[PDB]
């Protein structure tokens, strides 16, 4: 048995147990991935590697994460691109920006990516996003085109509560977003 646990309820200016990539940084008790500015990518990773499955016994881990986040845009119409919680190789580095959310490079399935992500997408990219043009929650495995998506109505500047749970017995991943 192996467990890894942490909680950060208030981020501080010197948050040494996080790895910052791109333009992500901590300020005002908040982790900010992006300021409201064009053309940026920001990522933050927890510092310890975590053991998600084991090739000697074939066992895979159960995990649960929760977080609250805010998207604050000039107005409700011009909003982009979105935010991801992701799981990737230990040496992961930022990938393509804009529509690719800093985590993928293509809409084509690439097993080399070895990344699964839960995205909260605010801009409709017509080459791969759901055709109705809605903002949405999506599960992405090795591609920016989601394997399944749920429409979500953005409430700009309001904080949202997210719980992501994975159950190893059934291999099911569940995502829940709540606004008060």
């Amino acid at each position: 048995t192996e467990t890894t646990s942490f909680s950060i309820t208030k981020f501080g200016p010197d948050q040494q147990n996080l790895i910052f990539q791109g333009d992500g940084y901590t300020t005002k008790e908040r982790l900010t991935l992006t300021k409201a500015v064009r053309n940026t990518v920001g990522r933050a990773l927890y510092s310890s590697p975590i053991h998600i499955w084991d090739s000697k016994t074939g066992n895979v881990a159960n995990f649960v994460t929760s977080f609250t986040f805010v998207i604050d845009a000039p107005n409700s119409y011009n909003v982009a691109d979105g935010f991801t919680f992701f799981i990737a190789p230990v040496d992961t580095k930022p990938q393509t920006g804009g529509g690719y959310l800093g985590v993928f490079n293509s809409k084509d399935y690439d097993k080399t990516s070895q990344t699964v992500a839960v995205e909260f997408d605010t801009f409709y990219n017509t080459a791969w996003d759901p055709s109705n043009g809605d903002r949405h929650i999506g599960i992405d495995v090795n591609s920016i085109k989601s394997i399944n998506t749920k429409s979500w109505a953005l409430q700009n500047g309001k904080e949202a509560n997210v719980v992501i749970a994975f159950n190893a017995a059934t291999n099911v991943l569940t995502v829940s977003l709540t606004y008060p």
């Binding site: 992006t34 919680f85 959310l101 291999n171």
Partner: protein, 47 residues
Amino acid sequence: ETSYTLNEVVPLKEFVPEWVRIGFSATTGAEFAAHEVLSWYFHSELA
């Protein structure tokens, strides 16, 4: 009281390495917004 749930079967052992890092990313392009996280909790257990 407004909620959005999504459930999917995803065989993680097939897609991801045994050891991983986890985190968050966000981007802007020709349109933008601030993307900020206020708190984070995580727990994993491997038998």
